[PDB]
Scaffold this active site. Sequence first.
Site, mmCIF file in Angstrom:
data_model
loop_
_atom_site.group_PDB
_atom_site.id
_atom_site.type_symbol
_atom_site.label_atom_id
_atom_site.label_comp_id
_atom_site.label_asym_id
_atom_site.label_seq_id
_atom_site.Cartn_x
_atom_site.Cartn_y
_atom_site.Cartn_z
ATOM 1 N N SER A 62 56.083 22.756 27.095
ATOM 2 C CA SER A 62 55.119 22.685 26.000
ATOM 3 C C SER A 62 53.696 23.120 26.346
ATOM 4 O O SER A 62 53.286 23.098 27.506
ATOM 5 C CB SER A 62 55.082 21.261 25.443
ATOM 6 O OG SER A 62 56.387 20.801 25.133
ATOM 7 N N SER A 91 60.998 20.448 32.285
ATOM 8 C CA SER A 91 60.225 20.677 33.498
ATOM 9 C C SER A 91 59.883 19.386 34.238
ATOM 10 O O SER A 91 59.654 19.407 35.451
ATOM 11 C CB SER A 91 58.924 21.416 33.157
ATOM 12 O OG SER A 91 57.952 20.549 32.581
ATOM 13 N N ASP A 149 73.364 13.596 27.424
ATOM 14 C CA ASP A 149 73.010 14.016 26.076
ATOM 15 C C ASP A 149 72.052 12.970 25.514
ATOM 16 O O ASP A 149 72.468 11.880 25.124
ATOM 17 C CB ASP A 149 74.263 14.109 25.203
ATOM 18 C CG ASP A 149 73.942 14.413 23.751
ATOM 19 O OD1 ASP A 149 72.754 14.625 23.432
ATOM 20 O OD2 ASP A 149 74.876 14.440 22.925
ATOM 21 N N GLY A 150 70.769 13.313 25.477
ATOM 22 C CA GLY A 150 69.752 12.397 24.991
ATOM 23 C C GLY A 150 69.952 11.788 23.615
ATOM 24 O O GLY A 150 69.378 10.743 23.316
HETATM 25 N N1 LIG Z 1 70.818 16.572 23.550
HETATM 26 C C1 LIG Z 1 69.932 16.800 24.532
HETATM 27 N N2 LIG Z 1 69.834 15.955 25.614
HETATM 28 C C2 LIG Z 1 68.949 16.138 26.635
HETATM 29 N N3 LIG Z 1 68.061 17.192 26.696
HETATM 30 C C3 LIG Z 1 68.146 18.036 25.623
HETATM 31 C C4 LIG Z 1 69.019 17.921 24.559
HETATM 32 N N4 LIG Z 1 68.818 18.991 23.645
HETATM 33 C C5 LIG Z 1 67.870 19.692 24.176
HETATM 34 N N5 LIG Z 1 67.386 19.218 25.381
HETATM 35 C C6 LIG Z 1 66.427 19.641 26.212
HETATM 36 O O1 LIG Z 1 65.183 19.700 25.454
HETATM 37 C C7 LIG Z 1 64.186 20.262 26.289
HETATM 38 C C8 LIG Z 1 63.166 20.864 25.214
HETATM 39 S S1 LIG Z 1 61.826 21.587 26.038
HETATM 40 C C9 LIG Z 1 61.187 20.045 26.795
HETATM 41 C C10 LIG Z 1 60.035 20.383 27.675
HETATM 42 C C11 LIG Z 1 59.427 19.318 28.621
HETATM 43 N N6 LIG Z 1 58.834 18.202 27.747
HETATM 44 C C12 LIG Z 1 58.269 20.057 29.329
HETATM 45 O O2 LIG Z 1 57.081 19.761 29.083
HETATM 46 O O3 LIG Z 1 58.659 20.978 30.129
HETATM 47 C C13 LIG Z 1 64.928 21.279 27.127
HETATM 48 O O4 LIG Z 1 64.742 21.043 28.518
HETATM 49 C C14 LIG Z 1 66.417 21.116 26.614
HETATM 50 O O5 LIG Z 1 67.387 21.502 27.584
#
Ligand SMILES: Nc1ncnc2c1ncn2[C@@H]1O[C@H](CSCC[C@H](N)C(=O)O)[C@@H](O)[C@H]1O
Length: 223
Positions: A62, A91, A149-150
């Site tokens: 982000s 990240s 899976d979040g």
């Molecule tokens: N169901 C899920 N469970 C866990 N991570 C997920 C997900 N769906 C998407 N993501 C993750 O969502 C993230 C969105 S980008 C997140 C960026 C992080 N906050 C930073 O500052 O770098 C990605 O890493 C993607 O792989």
Amino acid sequence: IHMAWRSVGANNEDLIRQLKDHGVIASDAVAQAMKETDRKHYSPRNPYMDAPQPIGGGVTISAPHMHAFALEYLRDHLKPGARILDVGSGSGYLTACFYRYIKAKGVDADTRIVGIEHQAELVRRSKANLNTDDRSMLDSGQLLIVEGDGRKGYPPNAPYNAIHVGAAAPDTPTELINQLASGGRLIVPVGPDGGSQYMQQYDKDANGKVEMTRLMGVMYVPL
Ligand SMILES: Nc1ncnc2c1ncn2[C@@H]1O[C@H](CSCC[C@H](N)C(=O)O)[C@@H](O)[C@H]1O
């Protein structure tokens, strides 16, 4: 080719100061947490540009101002002894920021910051980022990066006082709300991928009743 302007800092501290001077960062605590977490360890290129940067897996870290808005939204929920969930840790940057924010408010052996990412490459990548930054965060056992899976949160450490979601939820994130503690807060972009979505806030009160508030219009587009 259409040319455009965009902010940049000479270094991490200068980037945060710039944001604070222009009103993006309201509280000093938020600024300090971001000051002590150098983007160079988390963003491969242009680390100090106020813009999203790619990190792999078709995703991006982000833009600095978006990280600031998220920290501000949960500034009163980030306290020593609490449990925080960062869905879509990528990240690992925002996760390291949570740890430092609370660490400043004082330490408590029960504090737990959990980051859940479903892409194995980013899980290994983020852990390496965090150890390049400060090996003691992961070593403390207070910061955690799990593979999963979040959308189903992480029950082992539930309930959570605060939950941040970096990826879009197609609709009301039921299971995440269920993992919120009374008086907890959840931030998440709601809506199908490809359209006018809303960054929404869900607060659960002492009676367990849930309240939703729209914070801002957002859109997930190709970088
Ligand atoms: N169901 C899920 N469970 C866990 N991570 C997920 C997900 N769906 C998407 N993501 C993750 O969502 C993230 C969105 S980008 C997140 C960026 C992080 N906050 C930073 O500052 O770098 C990605 O890493 C993607 O792989």
